[PDB]
Structures are given as structure tokens and as C-alpha cells.
Amino acid sequence: GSHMGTVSWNLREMLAHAEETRKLMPICMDVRAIMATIQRKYKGIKIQEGIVDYGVRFFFYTSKEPVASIITKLNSLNEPLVTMPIGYVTHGFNLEEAARCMRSLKAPAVVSVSSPDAVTTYNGYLTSS
């Protein structure tokens, strides 16, 4: 209900949700927690910095490109999305920086944290003053 916003799913839930539904799954190449699970599950795919059209429209990126430029590309797809906060490790951010990054994307990326309790904490930073 509503746009889901900010939640506590897990990697399997987040993946399977956008298998079943029509959300993009943007993923950083720099995340073995996720990357490995794609090449494990989906065999018939090629990694690049581009769009892929195998499984869940996977839009991969190299750490080479700035976080702001990923937001910029994603702003043009204008689909609802499901991801983890892109900038946390591939830029060495913390949870607040990681939030104020994602907020920049107009299209609704459903996004998750490592606990149901932190779901509001994350949203907290979107609406900081």
C-alpha cells in the first residue's frame, strides 16, 4: 500500500519482489553481498556498467562513476525501483549521507536497512532539518 517508501526487507525478499513486480533493481557492481547472488541464480547474464534485461532489468554501475551520476541516470527511467542505499561502501558513507544521497532521486526507490527499527531512522534523515 502506498509507494512502500522505506522498509525492512532482506536481499531475497527485495530480489523476489521485483521478479514478481515491475520495479527496476539497480545494484552496484561493488557489492558481493548482492552481485554473487545474481551470478549464482541467473547464469545467462553478462556484467557491464549498462542496463541488462535478464531477470530484473538489472542496472549495474562501477564505483568509477559518482553516486550523483547514478541518481541522474535513474531519474530518467521514471519507474518505481527497489534497492539498498547505493552510497554507503562504494563511497564510504554513513546512514545519513546514504539517505541524503537516495532522497535526490525523484522516482520512488523502495529502500531497506539492516533492521525494522532503523526503517524510520533512515526516513528521519530524508526529513532532517
From Swiss-Prot:
- Per UniProt, residues of the Macro domain are 5-129
The effect of residue 21 to A is: In strain: Isolate Shanghai QXC1
Can you say where in the cell this protein is located? Host membrane; Host cytoplasm
Q: Which cofactor does it need?
A: Zn(2+)
The superkingdom of the source organism is Viruses
Q: What's its membrane topology?
A: Multi-pass membrane protein
Q: What does this protein do?
A: Responsible for the cleavages located at the N-terminus of the replicase polyprotein. In addition, PL-PRO possesses a deubiquitinating/deISGylating activity and processes both 'Lys-48'- and 'Lys-63'-linked polyubiquitin chains from cellular substrates. Plays a role in host membrane rearrangement that leads to creation of cytoplasmic double-membrane vesicles (DMV) necessary for viral replication. Nsp3, nsp4 and nsp6 together are sufficient to form DMV.
- What does the record's free text say on domains? The hydrophobic region HD1 probably mediates the membrane association of the replication complex.
Q: Which named protein is this? A: Papain-like protease nsp3
Q: What is the lineage of its organism?
A: Viruses, Riboviria, Orthornavirae, Pisuviricota, Pisoniviricetes
- Interval of the full protein contained in this chain: 1345 to 1469 of 4382
